[PDB]
From a paper:
This enables PLs to operate through a β-elimination mechanism that relies on proton abstraction from the C5 carbon of the uronic acid sugar ring, resulting in double bond formation between C4 and C5 and elimination of the preceding sugar.
Based on the Apo structures of BtPL33HA and BcPL33HA, combined with Consurf analysis, a total of 20 BtPL33HA mutants were made in order to understand the roles of individual amino acids in substrate binding and catalysis. The complex contained two molecules of BtPL33HA in the asymmetric unit, with one molecule containing electron density for which a trisaccharide could be modeled, and the other for which a less well-ordered tetrasaccharide could be modeled. The Zn2+ coordination site is a conserved feature in PL33. The +1 subsite, the site of catalysis, is where the majority of interactions occur. N238 interacts with the carboxylate of the +1 GlcA through its amide group, while Y291 lies ~6 Å from C5. However, neither the presence of the mutation nor the substrate induced a conformational change as indicated by unaltered scattering profiles.
Author numbering:
A (entry chain A): 18 to 635
B (entry chain B): 19 to 459, 474 to 635
The structure:
């Protein structure tokens, strides 16, 4: 945690008040009545959105019964409540887009229905999140509102519906818009202003506690609501400045190098929601309060590009899937905002030759913003170019590639990272995007997943990462079990780190240097060690999949998904192949039926020594 | 008439001394007393459980804003009322099922229904919401009024709260809390704070209507107060308010007890006055009770007297010739006012079926039906009643003989409730079957299509002052007589026209005796009938219908013709079938003074 306070340094409440844009004059979309401008903006989205709206003309708004909320306490079931809720929010979002597209009033009745139904609900908070209320129950309490992920998005959607359709709504019956204003005030504006203690706001934050994607996600939704619904400038400045102080906590907490250490699967709602917040803040201040030019924000956006190997494969240190992806439209908008050509070309690449269409779902801001970017994203040339080395020195992630299709990810770090695996010093090797030396990634949660016994799960253990068992001992969990002297020579493509301190006293190791050198054709892996005492033989493990063969002593071949490599290992080792049948669908959906651990074992025992391994395409 | 019977029975102070607090007046066993519920329920138990089981997966129906808006757009009420009524019925059924079973199986659905109900902005019907300040058909969260629906919804919610607060609170206490707030905001507060709801009849003046809304809404509000208001001073004030309001209704209806709207309104007019008085009695430990007042007994007995048989009822004004009643209600009302006639009549209406719990959406009637079942099941069925019933202010007269003829006749005035221009008309039934009929619920409103003359060829005119004079009934002779002359306009040029009905053991004699100012155009006399109508000879008409056979003898100066009336309106064709007839009697004769005799007998 670093006190950068970038937003507070850019403006105080007095500065803010002088630059806030009132009366929603900041809104970038045409007036609902401006049919020609909607037709130009919409392009080929028009007919698609209209057709999606037509499918909802007889949509029956779904009631959520008390028992669906109660079921969270009874069994932990979330989906019983979330499925009808999300169906409603998606319908309302789609109807908004359809009515903007067509402008004939055909969807207005259903928009009005959705809005009115939404006001009658006691709360927009998810059943799993309601237990943070005073009563600690999973059922709404009509006397109290909190804000969660769902309710903020629900609120923002309602605010946009209100903004676009207030006039046709009031023609039908002005009480609808009136109740919408009341609902948004009670469920977003007031709780946001009056309750300093919502955990995601991080006003009470201290070391040890978590700040995560909830912070920019909830702040960006609240910010939209205020900018759309709060017409008192004094009240608006106070709310906006509060949001700036809150989001500063998030910016202060993440690393300046821009690596999202949970991995790419959170990126869209972490860095991507920080982007949304900053765009919204910029729009609301006529561009005068903008961090979109800050290099750290660009690095946070570019992490999604650098970490995306290809064909759905992503770098997956820690408890993260080896499969991933992104919203190309979001990535494009983020890229353009921070002037990252790399991100803009990457977004075009991720389209996979699809034409960009409006983002549907239930996120009103991203749906509307997707309309603005489509035409430009459509013209963008697809390319996934990046430097041969990306070095995140604080997070200690290192990506290194060559022009013949090898991509190596390596890490230093410490065994108390977010979603930690005991993996200090590990590497992953991809060949033409295909994992060849892999990192197994994320399994289904069990009771053992959190707490002592986390490290009894094989996916979390150094034993099942691309690492040694020093004197036969694996790495230990803990903040102080860490890399030392981690370096990256960007020009030579050499990553090096001393992993000795990631192992417990029983490992009896003074130093162990693990280094990776990538040349134009091969990856050289070296170990260089000094032990206090030679207790037991070292073991070295590699994780892989596909078709594994052993043509001769010192040689392994791996053939997987059209790629083929040879791994040369010291002949002092006896190589065995362990089959890991994958019962857990979260794993088998990525890797198929089984993966392998290659074990390299020896009878040797010495206080010093070194190993070289070489991997090349064949 | 200022009877003010409730205000005479107590003021606010004496009421406060006899009010029963803490719901100790409730006549039903505690939810947790399984054995007492099993005894009370009897054979209702298995049936109510099965009805609950059918609702275990019932999806509570949302009412969209457009359903309320549709009332303004097109006048459509059912688009809103059908899901609303389905919800209310489900909730009432689930209550009864859970009382019946007591295993907790229906509690989750009861809780769901109650919670859903609190989330609705209003319990008022779309057709009734336009009496709010804004005059719109959509709920406005800023204001609550009370209508028929909302009062019943409120009372149901109050009973659900009363029976199931403890198991609800075990699950989550916020449900019962919100129910208490909802009933306070939608029933208790508006009732006390708004003097201007039309049905309350505070500030009534001549010309305005007080109808079934008054006792119906007051009975529902009264239940909510008795169940939900535990402050004694607040309770007394609300209950006394209800007494003043219902006095307005009691003051407005005729003391003879006839419901001029007919047997179909009876259940929610007189029947809701009964409900109110039962509830008030129960809530004051029997100390404030009008159930012993003769007028209340007469109001109850109207339902028995007006029911001819086999679904056929007397149907003056805009009312159906087919009707009936809730036997369980009739029994309870009868027992409360000590009407042996009503009790036996209720058992008769069962038609040999066993009485079961009343379902629907009226919690009070459902619960009360459970109390009376075993007793009604032991009741012996009979429909006995006097040969003559005479309602002298309403001017309705029923007369029967031992050979199965039943005649209904009326005086009145052409501005009665749901008026037909029918001053002086009659209806004849034979072994319960209509033979000279009143078409019921526009040609159906015209004297032209009632059993009446067209004087100098002119029909009756609509209006308050178009009325009978000198209406008499000789109860012993079975003679009804009235002068209908003033029900006709000036151009009818009639000084007097006496229409009289004499029923003896064998025949109905109908007479017309008239004096005209001037003979302008021939009189015409009409009769309405159905079935198989023939004309065997001059002066004779034969009517054969549903197994009955009569002859109508008429003066030979008339030429009789049969006019077919095709009934395309299903509300009429579902009663009478595809067509009915008007017999017209026409003549060339014209005289200033004359008389006609008509005789109807079975052959
Ligand atoms: C129940 C609870 O409070 N859990 C806390 C954690 O929050 C969870 O974070 C998830 C996340 O951001 O991945 C949330 O998942 C996301 O939910 C939204 C709204 O329904 C949806 O749009 C996304 O698709 C979805 N993403 C998924 C599943 O990947 C989840 O709602 C939420 O409960 C919280 O992060 C941690 C902080 O330490 O504490 C838990 O107690
Ligand atoms: C629209 C309006 O305000 N109409 C006023 C009349 O009220 C109607 O009275 C009807 C009645 O008492 O018969 C009501 O019908 C009954 O409605 C209840 C509740 O929903 C239902 O349980 C009954 O079964 C039903 N009866 C039927 C169908 O026969 C109706 O809801 C109500 O609108 C009012 O009496 C007159 C008096 O002058 O004024 C009208 O404006
Ligand atoms: Zn791992
Ligand atoms: Zn009639």
């Amino acid at each position: 945690y670093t006190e950068r306070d970038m937003l507070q340094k850019a403006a105080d409440e007095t500065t803010l008040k002088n630059v806030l844009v009132m009366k929603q004059a900041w809104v970038p979309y045409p007036a609902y009545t401006d049919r020609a401008a909607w037709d130009s903006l919409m392009g080929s989205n028009k007919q698609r959105l209209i057709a999606a709206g037509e499918k909802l003309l007889d949509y029956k708004w779904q009631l959520i019964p008390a028992t669906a909320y109660l079921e969270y306490e009874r069994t932990g079931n979330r989906k019983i409540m979330e499925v009808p809720y999300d169906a409603n929010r998606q319908a309302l979002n789609t109807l908004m887009l359809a009515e903007l597209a067509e402008g004939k009033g055909r969807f207005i009745d259903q928009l009005l229905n959705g809005a009115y139904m939404s006001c009658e609900m006691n709360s927009w908070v998810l059943s799993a999140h309601l237990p943070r209320q005073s009563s600690k129950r999973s059922l709404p309490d009509f006397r109290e509102q909190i804000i969660d992920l769902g309710s903020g998005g629900y609120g923002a959607l309602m605010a946009w519906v209100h903004y676009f359709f207030r006039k046709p709504f009031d023609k039908i019956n002005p009480v609808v818009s009136l109740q919408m204003r009341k609902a948004i005030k009670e469920r977003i504006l007031d709780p946001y202003m009056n309750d300093d203690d919502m955990w995601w706001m991080a006003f009470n934050w201290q070391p040890g506690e978590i700040i995560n994607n909830w912070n920019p996600w909830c702040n960006s939704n609240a910010l939209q609501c205020f900018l759309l619904m709060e017409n008192n400038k004094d009240r608006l400045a106070k709310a906006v400045y509060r949001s700036m102080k809150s989001v500063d906590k998030f910016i202060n907490f993440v690393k300046s190098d821009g690596a999202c250490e949970e991995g790419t699967s959170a990126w869209g709602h972490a860095a991507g929601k920080l982007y949304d917040y900053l765009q919204i803040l910029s729009d609301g201040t006529g561009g005068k309060i903008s961090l979109l030019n800050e290099p750290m924000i660009r690095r946070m956006g570019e992490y999604m590009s650098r970490s995306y190997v290809g064909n759905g494969w992503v770098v997956n240190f820690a408890d993260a899937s080896a499969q991933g992806g992104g919203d190309p439209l979001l990535i494009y908008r983020f890229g353009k905002a921070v002037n990252s050509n790399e991100m803009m070309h990457f977004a075009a690449y991720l389209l996979n030759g699809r034409k960009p269409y409006a983002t549907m779902g239930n996120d009103a801001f991203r749906s509307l913003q997707s309309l603005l970017c489509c035409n430009d994203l459509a013209k963008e040339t697809p390319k996934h170019d990046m430097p041969d080395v990306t070095w995140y020195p604080e997070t200690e992630f290192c990506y290194m590639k060559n022009k013949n299709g090898m991509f190596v990810a390596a890490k230093g770090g410490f065994n108390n990272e977010s979603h930690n695996h005991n993996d200090v010093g590990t590497f992953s090797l991809y060949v033409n995007t295909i994992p060849v030396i892999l990192d197994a990634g994320v399994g289904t949660y069990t009771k053992q997943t959190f707490g002592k016994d986390r490290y009894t799960i094989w996916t979390m253990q150094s034993n099942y990462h691309n690492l040694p068992m020093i004197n036969g001992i694996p790495q230990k969990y803990g903040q102080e079990y860490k890399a030392t002297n981690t370096t990256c020579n960007e020009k030579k493509r050499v990553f090096s780190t001393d992993i000795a301190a990631a192992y417990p006293s029983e490992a009896k190791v003074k130093n162990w240097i693990r280094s990776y050198t990538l040349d134009d054709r091969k990856l050289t892996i070296t170990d260089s060690y000094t032990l206090e005492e030679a207790v037991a033989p070292n073991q070295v493990n590699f994780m892989t999949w596909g078709n594994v063969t052993f043509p001769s002593q010192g040689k392994i071949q791996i053939e997987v998904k059209g790629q083929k490599v040879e791994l040369d290992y010291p002949t002092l080792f006896k190589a065995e192949l362990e089959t890991i049948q994958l019962d857990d669908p979260r794993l088998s959906n990525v890797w198929g039926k089984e993966i392998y651990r290659i074990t390299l074992k020896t009878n040797e025992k010495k206080e010093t020594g070194n190993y070289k391994f070489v991997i090349q395409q064949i």
